[PDB]
Structure formats: C-alpha cells, structure tokens
Design a binder for this molecule. Structure first.
Ligand code: MG
Ligand code: MG
Lengths: 269, 270
C-alpha cells in the first residue's frame, strides 16, 4: 500500500526539465480564437448555460485538438500546461467566464468550488481537490509532488506513513449531519500502481483540527514543513508570469503550486 | 527527534537473552517474608492505610535491598523481574492487598487504576500508563516482549511507519475526560527525548473505541502500524513466557516492555 521505491514517469521532474516552457505551452491561433468566441456567442444567443453543456454540444474542431494536447500533458505528461491566446480581450467578466467554460468543456467536467456551487471563481504550496486546476488571466510557481515523494524517500522515509495517514481539514460547514467538522485527507496515496498526491490548504488543516479540539502533533508539523521546504528549493520548482489571455493549468494529482484572474476546477471523468 | 539507529542497552532483548529466568528472578527468604508479614500486621493493627504511607515509614532492612535490585533491573536492566516468595499463604484478599502494598512502597508510588481510585485490582500486547506494572498470584501464561527490540525491528522492516508511532493514536478516555475535552485523547506510542527512547502501547480496544467516539474511521496505514507492532511482538523468538505460582509477583517496566496475558495488580510510578 505504501510505495517504497522511487516513483517514475513524465510527472517526475525538477526545474531544469521544464524550464523550457515551449514543451508545455500551447498557443491558440486566430482560427481557434474565432471558434471559441463563436461557440460562446452561440451559447449566449440561445440563453444556454455552459456548465450544463457537454463537449459534443460545443464542438471545437481545431481548438479541441490543442486543448486535448493540454489534457495529455496534464494527465500523462509533466502535469502542467499553458494555453495562450484565450480570447478575453475586450470581454466582460461574465463573457470571459463563458469563454473559459467553453475551453473547460474540452478539459473535462467543471465542478463546484464552493457551497454556492460556483464553477468559476474570481480572484502556501498546495494542490486542490479536482484533477485539474485552471487559472486564466484577464488583467505562479509549480513543483512536482512526485519528485517531492522521491526526495522524502531519500531524506526522510520515516515520515512517509504520516503522509499516507493525512491530516484533518475543515469541512467549512458542509459535513453531512452526524459527522465531525473536519475530515481526514491523505497527502500521498498509492493505488492501482499509481502514486497520487493532494496537499490541501494547510490553514484549513489548522482550522479543522481547532474545530476538532486537538493540537497538531509536532511530527505532523515536521512532515508538512518538510514537504513545503522540499517544494521551495529553487531546483524543485518552475516559475512563470501570466499575461492576459494566458490560462495556466496544473494537474493536482502530481503537482503542487503557489501564487484579475478566473479559476476553474476540472475533473477528468 | 526521531531515532534512526538501533537502540542498545540491557532493555533490548529477544527470548534468547531472557529465557534463563535466573538472571531476573529475586527470591525472598524466610527472614524477608517474616519482615513483610510483620510490617503488614503492624499496619493492620494500627488501623493505618498502606497506600497513604511512604517507604521510610515501612522500612524493610533485608527485603528492601532485594526489592531495590528488582527496581534497578526494571529501570536499567531487562525491564522485567520476578519477585518470588511474597508471603500470601493463608491470607484474605484484603490482607494480601496490604502485603502487596508493603512490597510496593519499596518499588515507588502506587497510583489509582480506576475512577474509584483503587490501587489494587483483582483479576492484546500492551503496556500500561505507570512506570511499573506488578502482578501477584494469590491462587493459580504471562508473556513479555522488549519494546526497544520491537522498535529496532520496525527500523529494519518498516521504517516508513516510524513517524506514525511518534504521532500516536486516539484512546478512549472512558468518560474521565475533563468535561471540556473530546471523549478521547491522543497518546504517542514512541517518544525520543533526552537521549532516551520510550514506549507506551495502550490497550487497542480503547484505541478503536476512542476513535469511534470521535466519529472517525481509523486510517488503514494506522491499523497497519498497530498490527505490525503486535505481529513483531507475537513472533516466538521475540517474547518470553512464564507461569506464576502463588507468591510470585511479576514486575514489568512499561517504558521498555510490552506484555500479554486470582491475581492482584498494582501500578507504580518511580
Ligand atoms: Mg489553487
Ligand atoms: Mg496488563
């Protein structure tokens, strides 16, 4: 159940292997921009909600190609990918939300980000719940969690089990009745032959344990701090700047990240 | 803070190093037995309570030295010791309790074992809260293992679990939780401070009970850790077994050992 030997694959990397962003940057050309804008326009003219639609309903012959490349890079490649030239210039926030929804349909299934069920949100090392997190600039650091696992295997293997146990995170009030405020979420998991990671926002961890009325064990804080320290080493993360129209995508299974923008949460079903 | 090299010392052993019980067994002779009986008689005659007394008040000129070797064996040696010939023959349960109290005064301070504050109790691998657990047979298999050796074995076979033990698990309060707190409290299984590794492996049923009360499901890796601990302890080469005869008082040091089963039980802090 616990991986005792180094993880391998395209998602295991340091900064040197991904510094050349051309390996994972995907640029929308004028045709693709036009197709996406046209799709959003037709969704708006028919009074549809892009979140209720699927990809068959909004085909993108040429752009769907590129977004599919992105998905490939995210789920089977480095884990991160940038889609440039998202046609947001001159659009209102809501219109941009629709255009991002259009692109999102070709990423996977958009999921709720809060209690209000929002599928776009206007805006410490972490990786959120869904498979893919997307961030579009209207007007950023990434590291490999797999490499972090290998580094822990080298430097502090006695801590590995802790990550598999995970820590308590605040429910924020959405717990089903008759269960505690904070749920236990594993940081590392090994199932089916694959290692995956989630490193939720720590403070909600603190919030959650507080709500449970417990102090964090020191060894747990050591584990967390060690994780974040490994991610914070200059050789372990890549950094970038988004310009308007840039949509940065990270795969939360294998990476962790840190920072007007809009955010989308996507599960790959 | 986490020990990454094998523990060394007397308290590190397998069954082979402790199989010969003559290395840890201490025998009370007639003089010592008479001494203990006389102290008990005096305590009962004078209507005193042995649990409120102290080691000076009940001196044992010959027996105290032997009991002192028992203590040294427990805290600095193997971590187990048998005291034989405790004079319980022909005594009532209460009288036997007083005699045990007399011996206990030279072990350390007896502590409460339940909510009523009983300091003698009539009768999974575990080690109880106090420094020393004592078990005297009145009428008539006890197994002991080294927690230090178990730690070394974990270092070899499953070091990736070590941190979990340092985090410890939740154990049911049993209801004595200060009204403010959650029914269950977190207890570390291994600790390393001041150059010394120590262990407590509280009753597992209370771990499950305790997490249950909290409305949580034990993580699989946690049950793996617990099961691994106990499996290592349960290996034939890793534990020693004995049978108590009347007058035999087995003492285990809960800092460095774990153990498994009319007897009376005493809890002692040093
Ligand atoms: Mg984020
Ligand atoms: Mg016991």
């Amino acid at each position: 159940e616990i991986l005792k030997k180094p993880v391998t694959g395209r998602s295991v990397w340091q900064r040197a292997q991904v510094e050349d962003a051309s390996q994972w940057t995907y640029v929308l050309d004028e045709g693709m921009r036009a197709e996406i804008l046209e799709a959003a326009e037709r969704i708006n003219e028919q009074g549809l909600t892009v979140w209720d639609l699927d990809r068959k309903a909004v085909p993108l012959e040429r752009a769907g190609k590129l977004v599919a490349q992105c998905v490939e890079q995210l789920e089977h490649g480095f884990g991160l990918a940038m889609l440039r030239g998202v046609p947001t210039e001159g659009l209102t926030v809501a219109e941009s939300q629709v255009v991002m929804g259009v692109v999102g349909l070709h990423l996977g299934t958009a999921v709720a980000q809060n209690g209000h069920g929002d599928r776009v949100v206007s805006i410490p090392w972490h990786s959120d719940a869904p498979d893919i997190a997307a961030l579009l600039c209207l007007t950023f650091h990434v590291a490999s969690a797999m490499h972090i696992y290998n580094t822990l295997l080298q430097e502090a293997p006695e801590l590995l089990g802790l990550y598999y146990a995970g820590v308590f995170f605040d429910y924020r009030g959405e717990e089903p009745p008759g269960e505690p405020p904070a749920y236990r979420n594993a940081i590392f998991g090994y199932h089916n032959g694959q290692l995956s990671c989630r490193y939720f926002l720590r403070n909600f961890a603190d919030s959650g344990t507080a709500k449970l009325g417990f102090e964090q064990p020191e060894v747990e804080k050591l584990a967390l701090d060690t994780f974040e320290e490994i991610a914070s080493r200059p050789e372990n993360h890549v950094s970038m700047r988004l310009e308007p129209g840039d949509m940065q995508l990270v795969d939360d299974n294998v990476t962790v990240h840190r920072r007007h923008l809009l955010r989308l949460w996507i599960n790959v079903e």
